[PDB]
Write a protein that binds this ligand. Structure first.
Ligand code: ZN
Lengths: 74, 106, 96, 55, 117, 117
């Protein structure tokens, strides 16, 4: 015989982290200069290949491909 | 054109005896009809393999035990004969259960 | 399930390669044999296809056995976009 | 589900390293001669493997 | 008209070529992957198409047309319960084909006519 | 390989148990009765003594293929080492296993237990 009581938590709650949706985060990556030359914001990764922009955050370029390998202080 | 001596050794392993004995006798007959100098199907001491186990599935009740056994028999034959004839002898007349293993020993 | 797209693509194409696949019930196993992937999503995708009605599944001695039916073959071929005439190895009539 | 924490502990030996190969039970395994089957299923199928009662 | 764009859509669906969206299309175009781009003119923001055109000029050609929701309909988005519009609603801002695929009956004609001149 | 003969025979026995129980699992609806293993120098022959041998064969003889392929992938045997042979029962009455399977099928359908037995 085994009769367990209803579980009681000494913890308010911890909900799954709903990931932060950004409304048109693509536009912050590029900037067209008067229907012509396009400029990249932030930075770029030389490893993956051109295109992947490097996150700014706290003085450490955080790429998307080399998430672990590339956090380059600048 | 192979006539070289090989001192080949064949050995047998199976749980059942009578079919093993028929295999051994058939091998001896096949060798003697080829006039091959040999040594008889020498018989190793029989190897008996036993498990002791509780009959109970749960552990309750009077202590009752049982032993479960196989009896494998290893008999081997060595031939001072060439390879090709021995190869055709050993590759034929095999029946299920009897396991046949060959060593050239050259 | 959380399955990579190339992972499911290649497990499905291999399943079409043979027509039958094993995935031992052992979980957390790093790489399933002769498929080079973790067996977890292999089992999960195969049971999903079974539930949809394209794979027949059997359990035996902590071993999983998956077999392809006719509509399963058709749907897998459509998934790979393989030509109609080619058939899996199960259809390769190796007579006794 | 993280790679470094899930299933992280080594399982070289102990009860959970070898399973029944029949039901996977951890309890009472016959490792002798590589059976690795629990005494229950062994009692069930011993006549089929070849294990017979003789004495 | 434009009955070959659906053909290339299908053949690059077969070979996983549609970098649907904006960031996927962008990453296909910046890499040596973007081959045929479709950016809808009929956009409320009227900025994303300008950015896509600027990146395409930098993988140069563009085939823009209009009517984004129809592009979502006949790009192949949703589930095929019926062969048409079985999905509730869907809208594809930009569709870029990465792999040429199998069929090129009219594909080389249309690109050279529109942008290559 | 170099494994002791005793452990080799033990593996043979457990292989036989696995195979017989697996054929009980699969071919129950096909009237499976017994499985026989015969190790020949090149191939290893498997024989399925069963009542519904035609159903065991399958269409185009594909079932005996796929099942064999199952074995071929289950026990890491290379292709062409396992060959399936389907055979009719000697007499399904004296095979108590077949009688038990028929009784099980009759009971599963909800028949007269007394009359069926
Ligand atoms: Zn990177």
């Amino acid at each position: 015989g085994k009769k367990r009581k209803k579980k009681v938590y000494t913890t308010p709650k911890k909900i799954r982290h709903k990931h932060k949706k950004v409304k048109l985060a693509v536009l912050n990556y590029y900037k067209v200069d008067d229907e012509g030359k396009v400029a990249k914001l932030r930075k770029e990764c030389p490893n993956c290949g051109p295109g992947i922009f490097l996150a700014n955050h706290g003085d450490r370029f955080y790429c998307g491909k080399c998430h672990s390998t590339f956090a380059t202080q600048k | 054109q192979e006539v070289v001596i090989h001192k080949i050794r064949i050995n047998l392993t199976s749980t059942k005896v009578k079919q093993l004995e028929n295999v051994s006798a058939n091998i001896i007959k096949n060798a003697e009809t080829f006039k091959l100098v040999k040594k008889g199907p020498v018989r190793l001491p029989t190897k008996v393999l036993k498990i002791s186990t509780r009959k109970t599935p749960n552990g309750e009740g009077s202590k009752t035990w049982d032993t479960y056994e196989m009896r494998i028999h290893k008999r081997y034959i060595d031939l001072e004969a060439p390879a090709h004839i021995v190869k055709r002898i050993t590759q034929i007349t095999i029946e299920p259960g009897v396991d046949v293993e060959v060593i050239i020993a050259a | 399930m959380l399955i990579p797209k190339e992972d499911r693509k290649k497990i499905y194409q291999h399943l079409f390669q043979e027509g039958v696949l094993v995935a031992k019930k052992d979980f957390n196993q790093p790489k399933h044999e002769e498929i080079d992937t973790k067996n977890l999503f292999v089992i999960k995708a195969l049971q999903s296809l079974t539930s949809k009605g394209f794979v027949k599944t059997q359990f035996s001695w902590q071993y999983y056995y998956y077999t392809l039916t006719e509509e399963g073959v058709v749907y897998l071929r459509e998934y790979l976009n393989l030509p109609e005439h080619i058939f899996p190895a199960t259809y390769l009539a190796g007579q006794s | 589900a993280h790679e470094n924490v899930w299933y992280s502990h080594p399982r070289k030996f102990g009860k959970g390293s070898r399973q029944c190969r029949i039901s996977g039970s951890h309890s009472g395994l016959i490792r002798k001669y590589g059976l690795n089957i629990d005494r229950q299923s062994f009692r069930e199928k011993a006549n089929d493997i070849g294990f017979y009662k003789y004495r | 008209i434009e009955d070959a764009l659906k053909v290339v859509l299908r053949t690059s669906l077969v070979h996983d070529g549609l970098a649907r969206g904006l960031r996927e299309s962008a990453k296909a175009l910046t890499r040596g992957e973007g081959q045929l781009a479709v950016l809808v003119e009929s956009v409320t923001e009227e900025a994303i198409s300008k950015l896509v055109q600027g990146l395409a000029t930098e993988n140069v050609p563009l085939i823009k047309v209009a009517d984004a929701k129809q592009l979502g309909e006949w790009a192949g988005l949703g589930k095929i319960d019926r062969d048409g519009n079985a999905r509730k609603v869907v809208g594809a801002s930009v569709v870029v084909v990465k792999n040429w695929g199998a069929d090129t009956q009219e594909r080389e004609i249309l690109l050279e006519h529109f942008s290559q001149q | 390989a170099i494994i002791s003969k005793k452990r080799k025979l033990v593996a043979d026995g457990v292989f036989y148990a696995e195979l017989n129980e697996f054929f009980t699992r699969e071919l129950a609806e096909e009237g499976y009765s017994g499985v026989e293993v015969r190790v020949t120098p090149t191939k290893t022959e498997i024989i399925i003594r069963a009542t519904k041998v035609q159903d065991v064969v399958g269409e185009n003889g594909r079932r005996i293929n796929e099942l064999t392929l199952l074995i071929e992938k289950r026990f890491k045997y290379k292709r062409g080492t396992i060959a399936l042979y389907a055979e009719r029962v000697h007499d399904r009455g004296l095979s108590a296993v077949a009688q038990a399977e028929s009784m099980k099928f009759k009971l599963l359908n909800g028949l007269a237990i007394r009359r069926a037995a």
